[PDB]
Design a protein around this ligand. Sequence first.
Ligand SMILES: NC(=O)[C@H](CC(=O)O)NC(=O)CP(=O)(O)O
Ligand SMILES: NC(=O)[C@H](CC(=O)O)NC(=O)CP(=O)(O)O
Ligand SMILES: NC(=O)[C@H](CC(=O)O)NC(=O)CP(=O)(O)O
Ligand SMILES: [Zn+2]
Ligand SMILES: [Zn+2]
Lengths: 310, 310, 310, 145, 145
Amino acid sequence: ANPLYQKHIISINDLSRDDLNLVLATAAKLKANPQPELLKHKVIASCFFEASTRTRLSFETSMHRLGASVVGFSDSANTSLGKKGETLADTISVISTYVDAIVMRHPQEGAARLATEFSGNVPVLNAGDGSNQHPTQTLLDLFTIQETQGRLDNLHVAMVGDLKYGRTVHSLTQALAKFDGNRFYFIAPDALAMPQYILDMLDEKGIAWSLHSSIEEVMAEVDILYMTRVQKERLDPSEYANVKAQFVLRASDLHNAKANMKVLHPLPRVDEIATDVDKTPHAWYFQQAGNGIFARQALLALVLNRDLVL
Amino acid sequence: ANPLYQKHIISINDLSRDDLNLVLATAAKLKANPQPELLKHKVIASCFFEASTRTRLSFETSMHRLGASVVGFSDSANTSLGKKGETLADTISVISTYVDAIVMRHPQEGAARLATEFSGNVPVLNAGDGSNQHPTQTLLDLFTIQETQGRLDNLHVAMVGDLKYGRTVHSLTQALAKFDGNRFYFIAPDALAMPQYILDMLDEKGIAWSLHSSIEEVMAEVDILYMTRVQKERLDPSEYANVKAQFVLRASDLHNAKANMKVLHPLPRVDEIATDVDKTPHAWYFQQAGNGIFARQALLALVLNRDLVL
Amino acid sequence: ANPLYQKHIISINDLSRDDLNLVLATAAKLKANPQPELLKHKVIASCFFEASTRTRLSFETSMHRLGASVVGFSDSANTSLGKKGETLADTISVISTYVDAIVMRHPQEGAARLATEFSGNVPVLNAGDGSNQHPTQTLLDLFTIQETQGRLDNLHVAMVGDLKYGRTVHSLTQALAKFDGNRFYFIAPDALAMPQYILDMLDEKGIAWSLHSSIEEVMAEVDILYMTRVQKERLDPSEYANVKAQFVLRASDLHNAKANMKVLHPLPRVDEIATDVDKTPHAWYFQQAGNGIFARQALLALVLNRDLVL
Amino acid sequence: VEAIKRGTVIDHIPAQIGFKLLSLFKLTETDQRITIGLNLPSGEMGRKDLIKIENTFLSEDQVDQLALYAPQATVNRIDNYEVVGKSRPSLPERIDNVLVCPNSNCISHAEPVSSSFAVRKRANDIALKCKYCEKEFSHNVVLAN
Amino acid sequence: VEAIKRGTVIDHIPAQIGFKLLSLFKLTETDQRITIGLNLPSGEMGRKDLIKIENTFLSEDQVDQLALYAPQATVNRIDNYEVVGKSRPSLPERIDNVLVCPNSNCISHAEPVSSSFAVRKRANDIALKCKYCEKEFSHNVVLAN
Ligand SMILES: NC(=O)[C@H](CC(=O)O)NC(=O)CP(=O)(O)O
Ligand SMILES: NC(=O)[C@H](CC(=O)O)NC(=O)CP(=O)(O)O
Ligand SMILES: NC(=O)[C@H](CC(=O)O)NC(=O)CP(=O)(O)O
Ligand SMILES: [Zn+2]
Ligand SMILES: [Zn+2]
């Protein structure tokens, strides 16, 4: 059995560099040579208690590409937990007797971790738990970086926007920090700064990072420009002064960028990325989203198949 | 005809040191010898389009105290302006054909000024217009400051709280600045700071003012500690970080306080003034509120009666 | 100084048979010979934080009937307590610096008592505090009971309806229990039964009382049939089974009724009293309501005027 | 050895009660020395608690406040290592601050006032009538904050 | 100086921490003789609290769960009136059940699960990382249940 067989995928913090590489390598192979019957006879639950377009749809699509069935809900309002007052615990207890794997996104941090404590032998894949982790986003992000840059080492990465509530960058920073020589640039408002527990992690590994108040300040050095949306759903009203994007990226701001730099964004974007960036050779958020398919198929295959020989 | 006969009372900026002095003197005379019939045969409008406890009630009590009748509303919701789409202008145009004077508080800045342009010969008295002016508050404030300090000049005054939206401190700062030698200390979050048009006016008269981050800092030299409430209802969501009072005066902060020092508050108070302050000798906000009677009787007397208080 | 001069009127429990008798006598004198100027120069607050038709209007009519002026509100929604987060205490602290007396009705039990601790020398008159006391109701009730029965002792009294939340029957039962030989019949669902602290007080004086499941049962021996409305607004949802009146008095239930028997109701009535009862000789709730004038003129006269009704 | 030089000693406190008294009237929120004996032998009471507070004294009213929990207790006023006063708690006419009115619609929960209940020996137990409420409950059900 | 045949003695408890220990550890729940000394004079610590429970002993990690509250406290296992074991509370790997995650959006608040943090001494204070939300906080912030 492979390393990830029957493993819960809750936080990048529980995965090793090898685990990541495994997912990425499998993603590359599935992208090149599809396996429509890989997960035949499997039934997976797609449970989203929080809004979503890319994550849910790509996951379910990935399930069908592998030949599995999908059961679930995109809203808890009509589940028994939403109308009859059932606990998340009890919910996971019964759904885990129906399916082979549970993909879940929840508004509270730790919801995916808790699930694993009630799913028995059913693997839980965290599609996002509050502003904590977003493992499959990182998987697809790393996959996208890897093929546009041919490396996951010695990169110059800049993350912009809401770094405090961005579960996207929390997971992406931890993962990249498992690779050697990467340098980070955090461009975010004071109130939505990159969490300290992430920084202490970077210092622990002797990884260089630094803060900046403008994008122009680093434009010429980055290989990856990772933009993020202000997570207004998670903001405390005492932070409502930050709803509007502080950094707006326009085609004109890319004049001195490395030719190979790619602009990434987990999406949705509100106004932090102007649409005139969409036509530049740097715009890579859609290709990025598209890679969500191969990365999630890879994860679903590794977790539900003892061995894969492609 | 006294200086204020048939005159609009809209902004302290329009009044002179003499006008202010005239009100205080009159208030003193009427407190000493009430004139129950002084305004008999007068019908005055009390129109509050915004919440109020002290201002409307003290004003109406004063009208009755002087023998006048009152008509009006304390909620625009049942006026034709509230249910039929009527302009404030037409509302004043018609009410000014019924009453001898109009007292009005309104949520928008400049409402009172607006009314004067449609009232004709009927004097408009500003009971508060948004976060702009609150002329009758300053009047009672001045009456109180002199009652407890013996004078209105050469005082050290600290104004704490929301100085940006406090129509109270706007009028009062302008009034106190018409007197000589006053020292101003402004204690407020940078987001709710005293407007520039007030500071400029101060610089103009070579008046001394300075910003401070705490009450302790100035507690030793202040004669009047003017506390204010954060005007939450006027804040923009991008300022919601300041909803909670930054400065809370507790009884234990009054040790370095001078024996003459008095704590004032236009009220209502949320938590900026602990209740343990209530029993100290420095607490004077309720005495202050009661002074609203005399000041408002005074102003009414001066505006609606031709001769000085005989 | 009459026994009630400058006195708070909060609970019948605080009053004695003599106090009650003094109000009724005064009411009789004033009904016979009105004193239009008796309270000239007085300003009284009418503060209703809870709905009211008879209590507030009869009270204000009485104030004017005696020559006094009135200020106040019939809805806390536009006071600073309703829109700025102000305590009831501070509200009373400031209003007590404007008026000669405060009349207040409030949704929470003990509000009136609370007010007395912040009003200073200004007497607080309880117009109803939650489901607790309603002192001025008992006063008008007693005036009516004597007007129609010739006495206040040795009567058979039936109280029907919501006796648990009826502040009306709480005060009245305590008042009638200060007189001798009264028989009490309580007709009410077990969920809305007369509180224990009332029964205990009755047992204490060896007063005779008994529970009954129907009106018919006691219609033959009752002198006063006191009907009440289910206090829906005070019920807990776990008591919503009792929202609909269990006892409905119809004209055809008045056959065994004694010629002297009168039906009273503090009002308003929902369906506990059919309209066919209105034209019978036993119906006396509107006459009762009108008596609110005399009782309230009386109390006001006694509290605000030093000498007895000359 | 154990003997305070000056202060108060609450002896003959029922079992499991001494701790209650400590958190109720928060007698431990002080800089003064306090020695506490729990589950101690007595015989005339089986086992009892004991609280001793130095340089701290209790007025009669304060002692009566204990009546509700430790009725057969004995408050020894101590000075100069000697017991200069001995009093026993007698039912107080009212209890303030410590308790919370059970009536959820009581104005006391929302406003800046101290709780207050009239104390009445009803029969099998004691009845508490709120000063604000006028509603009365059995001491058993009336909670403390 | 007191004396007990068998049991445990927690000494060198910071002032104003003893009473808390008795509380959130339900130590007074037993019916075994207990002796508490609050604000007692201490040679090198100034003042201190001291607890004695005869016939009772603590957990090797509860002694560590004690390392958070009274880092310089000392538990003494006693038998036959003698200190057969002197211990010192050392920082444990994790704390379970007693702490409450300061993050209001942590699932641990809404569901039937026991709290759990990972202990890790930081620069000056101690850092607590929630097992659920994975957030980290200064032990000062977490100690406010
Ligand atoms: N954390 C997220 O949900 C990230 C970042 C963001 O929402 O701004 N977005 C996504 O996963 C895309 P989705 O909400 O369409 O599934
Ligand atoms: N601007 C005001 O209305 C000031 C300050 C404040 O509201 O905090 N307050 C008053 O005038 C008292 P009111 O609103 O009870 O009439
Ligand atoms: N308790 C009361 O207010 C009683 C009984 C009831 O409301 O049913 N009614 C009155 O006092 C008449 P009001 O509410 O019209 O002033
Ligand atoms: Zn109560
Ligand atoms: Zn947590």
